Design a protein around this motif. Structure first.
Motif, PDB file in Angstrom:
ATOM      1  N   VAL A  73       0.851  -1.183   0.000  1.00  0.00           N
ATOM      2  CA  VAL A  73       0.000   0.000   0.000  1.00  0.00           C
ATOM      3  C   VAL A  73       0.894   1.243   0.000  1.00  0.00           C
ATOM      4  O   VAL A  73       1.683   1.455   0.929  1.00  0.00           O
ATOM      5  CB  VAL A  73      -1.011   0.012   1.186  1.00  0.00           C
ATOM      6  N   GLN A  80      -8.290   6.902  -1.148  1.00  0.00           N
ATOM      7  CA  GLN A  80      -7.470   6.054  -0.286  1.00  0.00           C
ATOM      8  C   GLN A  80      -8.158   4.714  -0.058  1.00  0.00           C
ATOM      9  O   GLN A  80      -7.489   3.676  -0.057  1.00  0.00           O
ATOM     10  CB  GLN A  80      -7.171   6.759   1.048  1.00  0.00           C
ATOM     11  N   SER A 101       0.089  -6.779   9.506  1.00  0.00           N
ATOM     12  CA  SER A 101       0.390  -5.508   8.854  1.00  0.00           C
ATOM     13  C   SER A 101       1.636  -4.845   9.408  1.00  0.00           C
ATOM     14  O   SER A 101       1.784  -4.702  10.613  1.00  0.00           O
ATOM     15  CB  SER A 101      -0.804  -4.535   8.937  1.00  0.00           C
ATOM     16  N   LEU A 112      -0.093  -7.285   4.786  1.00  0.00           N
ATOM     17  CA  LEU A 112      -0.228  -5.946   4.214  1.00  0.00           C
ATOM     18  C   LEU A 112       1.018  -5.128   4.542  1.00  0.00           C
ATOM     19  O   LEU A 112       1.402  -5.039   5.701  1.00  0.00           O
ATOM     20  CB  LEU A 112      -1.455  -5.263   4.810  1.00  0.00           C
ATOM     21  N   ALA A 143      -7.967   2.519  -3.313  1.00  0.00           N
ATOM     22  CA  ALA A 143      -6.620   1.939  -3.395  1.00  0.00           C
ATOM     23  C   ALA A 143      -6.459   0.745  -2.445  1.00  0.00           C
ATOM     24  O   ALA A 143      -5.905  -0.287  -2.827  1.00  0.00           O
ATOM     25  CB  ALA A 143      -5.594   3.012  -3.085  1.00  0.00           C
ATOM     26  N   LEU A 144      -6.961   0.884  -1.214  1.00  0.00           N
ATOM     27  CA  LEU A 144      -6.920  -0.210  -0.247  1.00  0.00           C
ATOM     28  C   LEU A 144      -7.839  -1.382  -0.640  1.00  0.00           C
ATOM     29  O   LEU A 144      -7.423  -2.540  -0.554  1.00  0.00           O
ATOM     30  CB  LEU A 144      -7.238   0.300   1.177  1.00  0.00           C
ATOM     31  N   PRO A 199       1.340   5.558   3.629  1.00  0.00           N
ATOM     32  CA  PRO A 199       0.174   5.657   2.752  1.00  0.00           C
ATOM     33  C   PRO A 199      -0.709   6.901   2.952  1.00  0.00           C
ATOM     34  O   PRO A 199      -1.568   7.155   2.119  1.00  0.00           O
ATOM     35  CB  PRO A 199      -0.615   4.393   3.098  1.00  0.00           C
ATOM     36  N   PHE A 217       2.414  -1.350   4.390  1.00  0.00           N
ATOM     37  CA  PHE A 217       2.080   0.042   4.117  1.00  0.00           C
ATOM     38  C   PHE A 217       3.351   0.865   4.099  1.00  0.00           C
ATOM     39  O   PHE A 217       4.165   0.795   5.034  1.00  0.00           O
ATOM     40  CB  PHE A 217       1.132   0.615   5.182  1.00  0.00           C
ATOM     41  N   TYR A 251       3.922  -1.220   8.867  1.00  0.00           N
ATOM     42  CA  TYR A 251       3.572   0.147   8.426  1.00  0.00           C
ATOM     43  C   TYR A 251       4.762   1.080   8.609  1.00  0.00           C
ATOM     44  O   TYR A 251       5.194   1.331   9.740  1.00  0.00           O
ATOM     45  CB  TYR A 251       2.384   0.625   9.273  1.00  0.00           C
ATOM     46  N   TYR A 278      -2.168   6.736  -4.783  1.00  0.00           N
ATOM     47  CA  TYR A 278      -3.251   5.770  -5.000  1.00  0.00           C
ATOM     48  C   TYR A 278      -3.203   5.077  -6.337  1.00  0.00           C
ATOM     49  O   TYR A 278      -3.799   4.005  -6.504  1.00  0.00           O
ATOM     50  CB  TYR A 278      -4.611   6.432  -4.816  1.00  0.00           C
ATOM     51  N   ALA A 292      -5.951  -3.333  -3.214  1.00  0.00           N
ATOM     52  CA  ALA A 292      -4.929  -4.187  -2.605  1.00  0.00           C
ATOM     53  C   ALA A 292      -5.544  -5.431  -1.964  1.00  0.00           C
ATOM     54  O   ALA A 292      -5.017  -6.533  -2.101  1.00  0.00           O
ATOM     55  CB  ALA A 292      -4.092  -3.395  -1.575  1.00  0.00           C
TER      56      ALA A 292
END
Length: 358
Positions: free
Chosen positions: A79, A139, A186, A154, A142-143, A159, A156, A188, A83, A146
């Motif tokens: 991510v 946003q 996730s 995930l 775009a998510l 993002p 990120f 990030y 976008y 994904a």
């Protein structure tokens, strides 16, 4: 899956971008990689993606060493900050896009797309196109895009960084709640402490290719490993006041610098003669009146910070000490005041190693 990294390195010639980091992420956990530009957080994320092969060390997803496993067989979903939407396509077509070249009828897709769109509260935007969408809605598209590939992990990368500042507060709560609900592991990457502090279960704090500290928001905030961690968490972060001399008088630990005397309330064992004092903005008060254990200064400048005001106090040593401006209203520049630190929340650091000692 869980993710465990062990003595992970990535060199670019002489550049030790990532220089030996170890941490684990629980299955379903949200973990932030946080630090300034050049700290190695992004390179670390790209190693987890499999886009970089490590220079050395290991990466496991669950039981399994994945170093040599290409990105698509890792089932990672990335991510990004942009976008990357097609404004000539509809939202539906934008989300369906990675499902071109596959198969299953002219509408197993649609079912898969509406399903994700409904989760993301954008199913009522499917027939529209990106130009008529807000930043928050884009946003989410775009998510959705994904997530439609059903990633197991995930990743990120900053993002929210292109998003307007007010929206970032709203959107980080949103991604936090979404990740909670999907239960997908996730990781990030962010240079913004507020983002890591409010979203992640645990935060890996990077500096110059090293993992300095790995812990919960409370841990990295309450117990920073060193001055660097104290300086990076919080907005404003910890104020440092150097050159305080340490003694014991009558069982109590005394801190002195020129005219300034600070007696700590309860016995504390401080093994150094010289320390750096750390005072967080929210753990300090401004007194117009001279009180015990206070630090003299002038109100230098008063500025807004979000919904709050920051009062910058200048000490006789030329330090700027940032404090929140609570009730009455903003003091005025030129006012002589006294900084009253909450002596229970004070930090002390080794001036040499910068290690937190209290």
């Amino acid at each position: 899956p869980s993710i465990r990294v062990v003595n992970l390195k990535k060199y670019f010639g002489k550049v030790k971008a990532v220089d030996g980091v170890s941490f684990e992420v629980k299955d379903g956990e949200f973990v932030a990689l946080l630090g300034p530009s050049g700290c190695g957080k992004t390179t670390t994320l790209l190693m987890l993606a499999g886009i970089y092969k490590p220079t050395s060390g290991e990466i496991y997803f669950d039981d399994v060493l994945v170093n040599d496993i290409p990105p698509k067989y890792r089932e990672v979903g990335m991510v990004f900050q942009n976008y990357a939407l097609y404004p000539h396509m509809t939202v539906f077509e934008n989300i369906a896009f990675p499902l071109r070249a596959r198969r299953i009828s002219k509408d197993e897709v649609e079912k898969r797309v509406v399903e994700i769109a409904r989760k993301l509260l954008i199913d009522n935007l499917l027939d529209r196109k990106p130009t008529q969408l807000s930043g928050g809605q884009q946003q989410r598209v775009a998510l959705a895009r994904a997530l439609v590939k059903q990633p197991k992990v995930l990743l990120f990368d900053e993002p929210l960084s292109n998003l307007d500042a007010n929206l970032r507060m709203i959107m980080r709560a949103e991604i936090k709640h979404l990740q909670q609900e999907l239960g997908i592991t996730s990781v990030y990457v962010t240079h913004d402490q507020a983002e890591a502090m409010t979203m992640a279960s645990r935060i890996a704090v990077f500096n110059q290719g090293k993992l300095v500290q790995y812990g919960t928001p409370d841990e990295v905030y309450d117990s920073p490993k060193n001055m660097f961690v104290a300086s990076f968490i919080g907005n404003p972060p910890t104020n440092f006041l150097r050159d305080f001399s340490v003694s014991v008088e009558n069982k109590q630990t005394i801190l002195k610098r020129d005219d300034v005397i600070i007696k700590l309330p309860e016995p504390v064992d401080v093994k150094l003669k010289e320390v750096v004092v750390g005072i967080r903005p929210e753990h300090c008060r401004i007194s117009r009146e001279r009180v015990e254990n206070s630090i003299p200064g002038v109100v230098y400048v008063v500025e807004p910070l979000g919904r709050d005001i920051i009062v910058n106090v200048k000490t006789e040593k030329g330090e700027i000490i940032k404090v929140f401006g609570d009730t009455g209203k903003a003091p005025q520049p030129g006012e002589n005041v006294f900084l009253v630190p909450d002596l229970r929340k004070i930090h002390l650091f080794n001036p040499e190693t910068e290690e937190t000692i209290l």
